[PDB]
mmCIF file of C-alpha atoms and ligand atoms in Angstrom:
data_model
loop_
_atom_site.group_PDB
_atom_site.id
_atom_site.type_symbol
_atom_site.label_atom_id
_atom_site.label_comp_id
_atom_site.label_asym_id
_atom_site.label_seq_id
_atom_site.Cartn_x
_atom_site.Cartn_y
_atom_site.Cartn_z
ATOM 1 C CA UNK A 1 142.226 76.894 88.132
ATOM 2 C CA UNK A 2 140.890 78.995 85.189
ATOM 3 C CA UNK A 3 137.552 79.825 84.107
ATOM 4 C CA UNK A 4 134.030 78.002 84.539
ATOM 5 C CA UNK A 5 132.058 77.313 81.390
ATOM 6 C CA UNK A 6 129.032 75.393 80.424
ATOM 7 C CA UNK A 7 128.588 74.194 76.761
ATOM 8 C CA UNK A 8 125.316 72.882 75.062
ATOM 9 C CA UNK A 9 123.834 72.327 71.793
ATOM 10 C CA UNK A 10 119.999 73.189 72.132
ATOM 11 C CA UNK A 11 116.875 73.151 69.632
ATOM 12 C CA UNK A 12 114.335 75.967 69.421
ATOM 13 C CA UNK A 13 112.235 74.132 71.942
ATOM 14 C CA UNK A 14 115.089 74.056 74.294
ATOM 15 C CA UNK A 15 115.729 70.384 73.795
ATOM 16 C CA UNK A 16 118.922 68.760 74.529
ATOM 17 C CA UNK A 17 118.243 64.963 74.639
ATOM 18 C CA UNK A 18 115.793 62.279 73.538
ATOM 19 C CA UNK A 19 116.095 58.531 74.808
ATOM 20 C CA UNK A 20 119.695 58.748 76.168
ATOM 21 C CA UNK A 21 120.895 60.456 72.823
ATOM 22 C CA UNK A 22 120.602 63.877 71.140
ATOM 23 C CA UNK A 23 117.247 64.859 69.831
ATOM 24 C CA UNK A 24 118.818 65.602 66.020
ATOM 25 C CA UNK A 25 120.843 63.468 63.647
ATOM 26 C CA UNK A 26 124.813 63.640 64.019
ATOM 27 C CA UNK A 27 126.041 67.005 63.270
ATOM 28 C CA UNK A 28 129.683 66.260 62.799
ATOM 29 C CA UNK A 29 131.185 69.750 62.618
ATOM 30 C CA UNK A 30 129.210 70.731 65.595
ATOM 31 C CA UNK A 31 130.307 67.815 67.481
ATOM 32 C CA UNK A 32 134.137 69.009 66.557
ATOM 33 C CA UNK A 33 133.368 72.255 67.920
ATOM 34 C CA UNK A 34 132.479 70.781 71.131
ATOM 35 C CA UNK A 35 135.661 68.812 71.012
ATOM 36 C CA UNK A 36 137.799 72.017 70.193
ATOM 37 C CA UNK A 37 136.179 74.145 72.752
ATOM 38 C CA UNK A 38 136.409 71.793 75.584
ATOM 39 C CA UNK A 39 140.001 70.383 74.590
ATOM 40 C CA UNK A 40 141.690 73.764 73.976
ATOM 41 C CA UNK A 41 143.549 74.802 77.063
ATOM 42 C CA UNK A 42 144.883 78.283 77.027
ATOM 43 C CA UNK A 43 147.575 77.389 79.679
ATOM 44 C CA UNK A 44 151.064 75.344 79.299
ATOM 45 C CA UNK A 45 151.083 71.976 80.849
ATOM 46 C CA UNK A 46 147.476 71.907 81.901
ATOM 47 C CA UNK A 47 144.270 70.397 80.274
ATOM 48 C CA UNK A 48 140.701 71.208 80.700
ATOM 49 C CA UNK A 49 138.424 69.335 83.029
ATOM 50 C CA UNK A 50 134.953 68.271 81.983
ATOM 51 C CA UNK A 51 132.042 67.701 84.587
ATOM 52 C CA UNK A 52 129.173 65.773 83.657
ATOM 53 C CA UNK A 53 126.004 63.819 85.219
ATOM 54 C CA UNK A 54 126.080 59.966 85.136
ATOM 55 C CA UNK A 55 123.369 59.626 82.169
ATOM 56 C CA UNK A 56 125.586 62.097 79.933
ATOM 57 C CA UNK A 57 128.734 60.097 80.549
ATOM 58 C CA UNK A 58 127.180 57.072 79.304
ATOM 59 C CA UNK A 59 125.354 59.071 76.398
ATOM 60 C CA UNK A 60 128.738 59.460 74.812
ATOM 61 C CA UNK A 61 129.811 56.427 72.760
ATOM 62 C CA UNK A 62 131.974 54.168 74.685
ATOM 63 C CA UNK A 63 134.664 54.215 72.159
ATOM 64 C CA UNK A 64 134.922 58.045 72.769
ATOM 65 C CA UNK A 65 135.215 57.796 76.637
ATOM 66 C CA UNK A 66 136.840 59.252 78.314
ATOM 67 C CA UNK A 67 136.786 62.632 76.210
ATOM 68 C CA UNK A 68 140.513 62.648 75.282
ATOM 69 C CA UNK A 69 142.768 65.009 76.293
ATOM 70 C CA UNK A 70 140.408 66.349 79.163
ATOM 71 C CA UNK A 71 140.072 65.362 82.642
ATOM 72 C CA UNK A 72 136.647 63.416 82.874
ATOM 73 C CA UNK A 73 134.725 63.975 86.179
ATOM 74 C CA UNK A 74 131.343 62.420 86.607
ATOM 75 C CA UNK A 75 128.782 63.504 89.226
ATOM 76 C CA UNK A 76 126.794 60.486 90.780
ATOM 77 C CA UNK A 77 125.680 59.825 94.380
ATOM 78 C CA UNK A 78 124.761 56.150 93.609
ATOM 79 C CA UNK A 79 128.067 55.223 92.234
ATOM 80 C CA UNK A 80 130.935 53.953 94.517
ATOM 81 C CA UNK A 81 133.443 54.857 91.962
ATOM 82 C CA UNK A 82 134.230 56.629 88.762
ATOM 83 C CA UNK A 83 132.810 54.443 85.908
ATOM 84 C CA UNK A 84 135.229 52.393 83.680
ATOM 85 C CA UNK A 85 137.186 55.050 81.655
ATOM 86 C CA UNK A 86 136.491 58.136 83.986
ATOM 87 C CA UNK A 87 138.979 59.813 86.089
ATOM 88 C CA UNK A 88 137.026 61.156 89.009
ATOM 89 C CA UNK A 89 133.555 60.824 90.651
ATOM 90 C CA UNK A 90 131.973 63.434 92.752
ATOM 91 C CA UNK A 91 128.718 63.778 94.863
ATOM 92 C CA UNK A 92 127.903 67.261 94.031
ATOM 93 C CA UNK A 93 128.769 70.135 92.013
ATOM 94 C CA UNK A 94 130.277 72.018 94.946
ATOM 95 C CA UNK A 95 132.419 69.077 95.694
ATOM 96 C CA UNK A 96 133.655 68.646 92.242
ATOM 97 C CA UNK A 97 134.609 72.459 92.089
ATOM 98 C CA UNK A 98 136.509 71.987 95.346
ATOM 99 C CA UNK A 99 138.359 69.100 94.177
ATOM 100 C CA UNK A 100 139.898 70.981 91.343
ATOM 101 C CA UNK A 101 141.419 73.085 94.309
ATOM 102 C CA UNK A 102 143.210 70.009 95.879
ATOM 103 C CA UNK A 103 146.981 69.166 95.540
ATOM 104 C CA UNK A 104 146.077 66.326 92.980
ATOM 105 C CA UNK A 105 144.400 68.820 90.568
ATOM 106 C CA UNK A 106 145.212 72.498 91.548
ATOM 107 C CA UNK A 107 148.173 72.848 89.086
ATOM 108 C CA UNK A 108 146.784 70.506 86.236
ATOM 109 C CA UNK A 109 143.468 71.905 85.737
ATOM 110 C CA UNK A 110 143.245 74.964 83.195
ATOM 111 C CA UNK A 111 139.425 75.417 82.265
ATOM 112 C CA UNK A 112 136.400 73.770 83.753
ATOM 113 C CA UNK A 113 133.563 72.837 81.206
ATOM 114 C CA UNK A 114 130.037 71.531 82.506
ATOM 115 C CA UNK A 115 128.809 69.513 79.682
ATOM 116 C CA UNK A 116 125.186 68.315 81.157
ATOM 117 C CA UNK A 117 122.673 67.326 81.831
ATOM 118 C CA UNK A 118 119.768 69.328 82.880
ATOM 119 C CA UNK A 119 120.420 69.578 86.580
ATOM 120 C CA UNK A 120 124.083 70.135 86.451
ATOM 121 C CA UNK A 121 123.625 72.964 84.099
ATOM 122 C CA UNK A 122 120.690 74.574 86.140
ATOM 123 C CA UNK A 123 122.809 74.619 89.318
ATOM 124 C CA UNK A 124 125.961 75.910 87.330
ATOM 125 C CA UNK A 125 123.844 78.535 85.690
ATOM 126 C CA UNK A 126 122.888 80.142 89.218
ATOM 127 C CA UNK A 127 126.385 79.365 90.730
ATOM 128 C CA UNK A 128 127.101 83.031 91.871
ATOM 129 C CA UNK A 129 130.203 84.080 90.211
ATOM 130 C CA UNK A 130 131.798 84.482 86.632
ATOM 131 C CA UNK A 131 130.489 81.976 84.215
ATOM 132 C CA UNK A 132 130.341 81.546 80.375
ATOM 133 C CA UNK A 133 127.699 79.761 78.492
ATOM 134 C CA UNK A 134 128.743 78.501 74.933
ATOM 135 C CA UNK A 135 125.301 77.742 73.484
ATOM 136 C CA UNK A 136 124.737 76.181 69.998
ATOM 137 C CA UNK A 137 121.256 77.149 68.713
ATOM 138 C CA UNK A 138 120.038 74.277 66.651
ATOM 139 C CA UNK A 139 117.612 76.215 64.314
ATOM 140 C CA UNK A 140 114.463 73.885 64.262
ATOM 141 C CA UNK A 141 112.304 72.205 66.898
ATOM 142 C CA UNK A 142 112.965 68.564 67.820
ATOM 143 C CA UNK A 143 111.052 65.970 69.999
ATOM 144 C CA UNK A 144 112.899 65.933 73.176
ATOM 145 C CA UNK A 145 112.736 64.570 76.445
ATOM 146 C CA UNK A 146 115.301 66.498 78.336
ATOM 147 C CA UNK A 147 115.664 70.240 78.159
ATOM 148 C CA UNK A 148 118.140 73.087 78.737
ATOM 149 C CA UNK A 149 117.267 75.419 81.798
ATOM 150 C CA UNK A 150 116.264 78.974 81.335
ATOM 151 C CA UNK A 151 118.869 81.375 80.507
ATOM 152 C CA UNK A 152 118.127 84.813 82.486
ATOM 153 C CA UNK A 153 119.186 87.157 80.063
ATOM 154 C CA UNK A 154 119.159 89.923 82.752
ATOM 155 C CA UNK A 155 122.558 88.327 84.113
ATOM 156 C CA UNK A 156 123.839 86.363 80.998
ATOM 157 C CA UNK A 157 125.025 88.781 78.208
ATOM 158 C CA UNK A 158 125.194 87.629 74.771
ATOM 159 C CA UNK A 159 128.682 88.543 73.752
ATOM 160 C CA UNK A 160 128.803 90.317 70.308
ATOM 161 C CA UNK A 161 131.828 88.469 69.324
ATOM 162 C CA UNK A 162 134.255 85.784 70.606
ATOM 163 C CA UNK A 163 137.703 84.509 69.299
ATOM 164 C CA UNK A 164 137.724 81.400 67.577
ATOM 165 C CA UNK A 165 133.743 81.119 67.678
ATOM 166 C CA UNK A 166 132.218 81.479 63.880
ATOM 167 C CA UNK A 167 129.330 84.070 63.893
ATOM 168 C CA UNK A 168 127.490 83.163 60.713
ATOM 169 C CA UNK A 169 124.733 80.436 60.273
ATOM 170 C CA UNK A 170 126.150 76.743 59.961
ATOM 171 C CA UNK A 171 124.130 73.890 58.285
ATOM 172 C CA UNK A 172 124.731 69.948 58.173
ATOM 173 C CA UNK A 173 122.116 67.777 57.203
ATOM 174 C CA UNK A 174 119.685 70.377 56.340
ATOM 175 C CA UNK A 175 119.723 71.838 59.896
ATOM 176 C CA UNK A 176 120.747 75.354 60.438
ATOM 177 C CA UNK A 177 122.437 76.411 63.596
ATOM 178 C CA UNK A 178 124.510 79.046 65.231
ATOM 179 C CA UNK A 179 127.052 79.413 67.775
ATOM 180 C CA UNK A 180 126.245 81.923 71.089
ATOM 181 C CA UNK A 181 128.673 82.752 73.719
ATOM 182 C CA UNK A 182 127.103 84.292 76.939
ATOM 183 C CA UNK A 183 128.724 85.736 80.143
ATOM 184 C CA UNK A 184 127.542 86.691 83.556
ATOM 185 C CA UNK A 185 129.427 87.859 86.765
ATOM 186 C CA UNK A 186 127.536 88.104 89.729
HETATM 187 N N1 NDP B 1 122.609 68.704 73.571
HETATM 188 C C1 NDP B 1 123.780 68.687 74.451
HETATM 189 O O1 NDP B 1 124.549 69.696 74.491
HETATM 190 C C2 NDP B 1 123.692 67.592 75.603
HETATM 191 C C3 NDP B 1 122.889 66.567 75.430
HETATM 192 N N2 NDP B 1 122.873 65.721 76.680
HETATM 193 C C4 NDP B 1 121.534 64.667 76.480
HETATM 194 O O2 NDP B 1 120.902 64.947 77.831
HETATM 195 C C5 NDP B 1 120.678 63.529 78.341
HETATM 196 C C6 NDP B 1 121.487 63.279 79.529
HETATM 197 O O3 NDP B 1 120.811 64.388 80.756
HETATM 198 P P1 NDP B 1 120.097 64.343 81.965
HETATM 199 O O4 NDP B 1 119.034 63.144 81.657
HETATM 200 O O5 NDP B 1 119.900 65.505 82.267
HETATM 201 O O6 NDP B 1 120.914 63.489 82.770
HETATM 202 P P2 NDP B 1 122.665 63.880 83.625
HETATM 203 O O7 NDP B 1 123.811 63.798 82.983
HETATM 204 O O8 NDP B 1 122.405 65.102 84.302
HETATM 205 O O9 NDP B 1 122.635 62.548 84.870
HETATM 206 C C7 NDP B 1 121.651 62.451 85.883
HETATM 207 C C8 NDP B 1 122.297 61.529 86.887
HETATM 208 O O10 NDP B 1 123.593 62.196 87.101
HETATM 209 C C9 NDP B 1 123.911 62.347 88.599
HETATM 210 N N3 NDP B 1 123.604 63.966 88.970
HETATM 211 C C10 NDP B 1 123.431 64.761 88.132
HETATM 212 N N4 NDP B 1 123.551 66.042 88.835
HETATM 213 C C11 NDP B 1 124.292 65.565 90.005
HETATM 214 C C12 NDP B 1 124.720 66.258 91.071
HETATM 215 N N5 NDP B 1 124.840 67.665 90.877
HETATM 216 N N6 NDP B 1 125.220 65.780 92.037
HETATM 217 C C13 NDP B 1 125.240 64.285 92.029
HETATM 218 N N7 NDP B 1 125.100 63.569 90.950
HETATM 219 C C14 NDP B 1 124.451 64.279 90.225
HETATM 220 C C15 NDP B 1 122.829 61.616 88.975
HETATM 221 O O11 NDP B 1 123.182 60.036 89.348
HETATM 222 P P3 NDP B 1 122.807 59.294 90.509
HETATM 223 O O12 NDP B 1 121.339 59.018 90.576
HETATM 224 O O13 NDP B 1 123.831 58.321 90.339
HETATM 225 O O14 NDP B 1 123.002 60.253 91.773
HETATM 226 C C16 NDP B 1 121.511 61.856 88.049
HETATM 227 O O15 NDP B 1 120.635 60.506 88.350
HETATM 228 C C17 NDP B 1 120.979 62.435 77.385
HETATM 229 O O16 NDP B 1 119.935 62.371 76.238
HETATM 230 C C18 NDP B 1 122.141 63.261 76.396
HETATM 231 O O17 NDP B 1 122.107 62.832 75.185
HETATM 232 C C19 NDP B 1 123.757 65.713 77.850
HETATM 233 C C20 NDP B 1 124.482 66.666 77.726
HETATM 234 C C21 NDP B 1 124.549 67.704 76.604
HETATM 235 N N1 3TZ B 2 127.679 72.012 71.642
HETATM 236 C C1 3TZ B 2 127.544 70.870 72.153
HETATM 237 N N2 3TZ B 2 127.661 70.526 73.599
HETATM 238 C C2 3TZ B 2 127.616 69.278 74.162
HETATM 239 S S1 3TZ B 2 127.851 68.976 75.580
HETATM 240 C C3 3TZ B 2 127.876 67.229 75.181
HETATM 241 C C4 3TZ B 2 128.046 66.457 76.608
HETATM 242 C C5 3TZ B 2 127.723 65.204 76.029
HETATM 243 C C6 3TZ B 2 127.458 64.753 74.795
HETATM 244 C C7 3TZ B 2 127.391 65.672 73.781
HETATM 245 C C8 3TZ B 2 126.904 64.763 72.502
HETATM 246 N N3 3TZ B 2 127.869 65.425 71.517
HETATM 247 C C9 3TZ B 2 128.973 64.943 71.291
HETATM 248 C C10 3TZ B 2 129.015 63.513 71.996
HETATM 249 C C11 3TZ B 2 130.238 62.867 71.855
HETATM 250 C C12 3TZ B 2 131.216 63.520 71.134
HETATM 251 C C13 3TZ B 2 132.682 62.787 71.145
HETATM 252 O O1 3TZ B 2 132.734 61.632 71.302
HETATM 253 N N4 3TZ B 2 133.331 63.723 70.773
HETATM 254 C C14 3TZ B 2 134.885 63.740 70.432
HETATM 255 C C15 3TZ B 2 135.231 63.985 69.067
HETATM 256 C C16 3TZ B 2 134.296 64.280 67.918
HETATM 257 C C17 3TZ B 2 134.709 63.515 66.902
HETATM 258 O O2 3TZ B 2 135.086 62.079 67.147
HETATM 259 O O3 3TZ B 2 135.139 63.933 65.815
HETATM 260 C C18 3TZ B 2 135.586 64.684 71.430
HETATM 261 O O4 3TZ B 2 135.119 65.558 72.202
HETATM 262 O O5 3TZ B 2 136.837 64.119 71.258
HETATM 263 C C19 3TZ B 2 131.265 64.847 70.614
HETATM 264 C C20 3TZ B 2 129.944 65.493 70.649
HETATM 265 C C21 3TZ B 2 127.575 67.139 73.974
HETATM 266 C C22 3TZ B 2 127.429 68.224 73.286
HETATM 267 C C23 3TZ B 2 127.127 68.397 71.930
HETATM 268 O O6 3TZ B 2 127.105 67.530 71.000
HETATM 269 N N5 3TZ B 2 127.590 69.676 71.593
#
């Protein structure tokens, strides 16, 4: 199995969600960035795995679930089976990551992408080991009811470049944003 990664888009006040959707109106190229990052696999005959909490799964429009071209794994202790359209169900992040080492998935999975929400980001974000964060900084405050956990910059180094990530300011619908990649190894 290849690298472990989180990806998120976050406002200045560290918001990621409001009322089961995003705090901001749709940013179509930002959404395409998420698709591109999470789907593109650096390894022949493998695809990437996405790990998400149950509310994040249900926050994706049903037409667009599962996330195509990726293996979709949902985290829940209440569900008894994967939701309609999802591929796997685990009861803890440790369990999900162990599952990628089983015979079913060992040779199928390239990158693992944690796609939220707050509790799985926080646990992944303190998982000792080599981890990257792909963070879109939405450069405005937006009312939110879900937030991204604190990024400890002593351990997460902001990388000064990364191939395939644009470095300048982006703007859609009057909203400026920029792309960042962080890396820790501990
Ligand atoms: N801006 C962005 O990049 C993103 C925004 N979002 C937004 O965030 C919100 C959804 O996030 P959030 O509310 O944090 O909810 P989550 O997606 O984390 O869902 C929480 C549910 O997932 C299960 N769960 C979470 N972590 C684990 C775990 N480690 N092990 C087992 N089960 C787990 C639980 O289900 P159970 O009770 O069944 O056990 C829990 O009640 C929405 O507003 C969405 O739009 C989400 C992702 C990214
Ligand atoms: N940087 C960032 N991280 C995350 S992490 C995360 C986890 C859950 C939800 C979101 C919400 N944003 C979405 C929601 C759905 C889609 C979707 O259906 N996408 C299709 C293709 C897009 C299209 O149809 O062109 C797909 O990937 O094929 C794309 C983006 C995000 C999200 C985010 O918006 N941005």
